[model samples]
Structure formats: C-alpha cells, structure tokens
Target: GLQEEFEEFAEKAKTLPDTISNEDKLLLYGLYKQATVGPVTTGRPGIFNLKDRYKWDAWKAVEGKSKEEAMADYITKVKQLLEEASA
Candidate 1:
C-alpha cells in the first residue's frame, strides 16, 4: 500500500545529500504536512521567521490536497529524489 511505501521513503529521504533543490525539498515539506496534518489553518509565520515562514508557506501551497493525494505526491518525489541522488 502507499502508506507503507510513503513511510519507507520518508525515512530514506534523510539519506539524500544536500544537493537537492530547496524547491523540491519544500515541495515535500508541504506534501508531508498535508499528509499528516491536513489543511493550513494556523497563522502564517512572520517575515523575520524566515525558516518557519518558508515551511508554513510550503505547507499552505498544498492546502487543498487530500491526505491520500499528499501521501502519494510525497512518495513520488522521494522516489525521484532518491534516484537522482544516486545517479
């Protein structure tokens, strides 16, 4: 099932080197949030809080995705990243 595969890649994603783009990285961040935490209802972080703001914005960007959709998206990206990292 996708659930099992998603978690498998989620763990493996950490093994990826720092060479991946922030865009790709944050895309997963958003999907992961949507998969686990659902929609974005919390306040957006302040500008001074750059790191959190990036993450919050990333998560917000995928706000309308269903939980299963988010999981599948994350799984696909993780697989792509892992393959690229190894290549």
Candidate 2:
C-alpha cells in the first residue's frame, strides 16, 4: 500500500523552478527521468510518507546518477551557461 502510493507520487512529481540558482537543481536533471523530477523541498516525502523522498533522492530521480557525478555535471553546465550568456 505504501509503496504504491510512494511510487505514484514520485512518478507524478511536478516541475522544478525555472530559475537557476545553486548547482543542486542542475545536478538533479542529470539523474532521474524528466517526468519523475521535481523540487526536493516541495516533493520531499516524510516519515510515514513512504519512499525516500529526501532532497538527495529527488535529485537521483532525474537520471539516477550518483550525487557526485551529477554535481560535477551541474557545475560544468552552470559554468557553460553563464559563459554563454555573458558572451
């Protein structure tokens, strides 16, 4: 019962903010599938809420990549985007 609901909620999570701030959000995009991605604070599943809906896990939903890997990628992308915008 719990698992089903958790899975459904994770699957139906909403979109993250469009504005880029810290590297965290960018990192999430490298982990899980787009459909499953959402803001950690907004979708974080609490105790008795089922599933690991923590911020770290939410980021994993994007591409399922490791946190370190995603963070590195986020840095690269953010730097690139900033440079491009400046240019």
Candidate 3:
C-alpha cells in the first residue's frame, strides 16, 4: 500500500515541514534515523527499512527562499507529487 508507507513518513510531526519537499523526506529520514541512532546510513536497520528512505534527499530540489524557508515549500512540492502520482 503506497499510502500506508508514505503516510507514516507523512505523519504529522513538529519540526518537520508541514508540507515537505523531496529533500524534506531525505532530511526526515535522516532525522528519524538520527533519532534512533547517531548517524544516517544507507538503509533503515530496523523499522525504517519498511519506509521510503529516498523521499528526503529528493526534496532538496524543491524551490525555497532558503533552507530555513524550504520547509514550508516542501508541503507544496509534496502536494504536487501526490496529485501527479494519483493522476
């Protein structure tokens, strides 16, 4: 189930972009992993393995006023991706 996998990653969490970009996912995974461990790795060694790890890095391409501002921009990028994928 795409939604199931993506949804967990999309689940609301403070500090995360309301709407994240591709990089947002990358950063998110890094945050998730970091929260669990101390560093980011190639794959999720535990439960994270079940999720998409690439989303964060991919979001880096989303346009933003700055990295700080990118967080808000990510939401719009995600909406676009979701709509396109659904279409």
Candidate 4:
C-alpha cells in the first residue's frame, strides 16, 4: 500500500547524505507537505521571509495533488536521490 511504502521511504530518507542540493531538499519538503497536509493553509510568507516563502512556494507548486499521488511521487524522489548519493 502507498502508506506503507511511503513510510518506509520516509525512514530511508533520514539517512540521506548531506550532499543533496537545496533544490532537491525543497522538492522533498514540498511533496511531504502536500502528502501530509493536503494544501497550503496560511497566506504566503512575506518577501523578507525568504526561507518560508520558498518552502511555501514549493508546497504551492504541488498543491491539488492527492495524498496518495504526493506520497508516491515523494517516495520515488527519495529513492532517486538515494541512488544519486550512492553513485
């Protein structure tokens, strides 16, 4: 099931090396939020809030995706990142 698979991958993701790029991290962050939270709830962060603003934008990009879809995509991305880290 997607929940089981997603949980497994999420555990594995914790072991990922520090070499992963910020872009990749943001991708995972967005997908994880989309899977767990459904959608953006609060207003966008102010321009001065660069970090939060970026994260919010990432979450917004994947907005409207179903939880299952987001989970599956997140798992796939984690696996791909792991492979790249190992390679």
lDDT of 4 by residue, 1-87 (tens): 889999999889989987788898889999999998899898999989898999999999999899999999999999998888889
**Candidate 2 per-residue lDDT over residues 1-87, each given as its tens digit:** 533443443333223334645454434343333223332334456686433444445454554444444444444554554565456
lDDT of 1: 0.90
**Candidate with maximal lDDT:** 4
- lDDT against the true structure, per candidate, is 0.90, 0.43, 0.42, 0.92
Which 10 residues in a row give candidate 4 its minimum summed lDDT? Answer: 17-26
Clash counts for the predictions, in order = 0, 8, 13, 0
Per-candidate TM-scores read 0.93, 0.33, 0.28, 0.93
Candidate 2 structure, TM-score to reference: 0.33
RMSD of each: 1.0, 14.5, 11.2, 0.9
Show model 1 residue runs off by greater than 4 Å: none
Per-residue lDDT of candidate 3, residues 1-87 (tens digit): 443433443454433444555544565444343333333335333446434435433332232234334443334445565665456
Model 4, runs deviating above 4 Å = none
Q: In angstroms, how far off is 78's CA in candidate 1?
A: 0.7
Candidate 3 Cα outliers beyond 4 Å, as residue runs: 1-9, 12-68
lDDT for 43 (candidate 4): 95
* Count: clashes, candidate 4: 0
lDDT of 1 at 43: 98
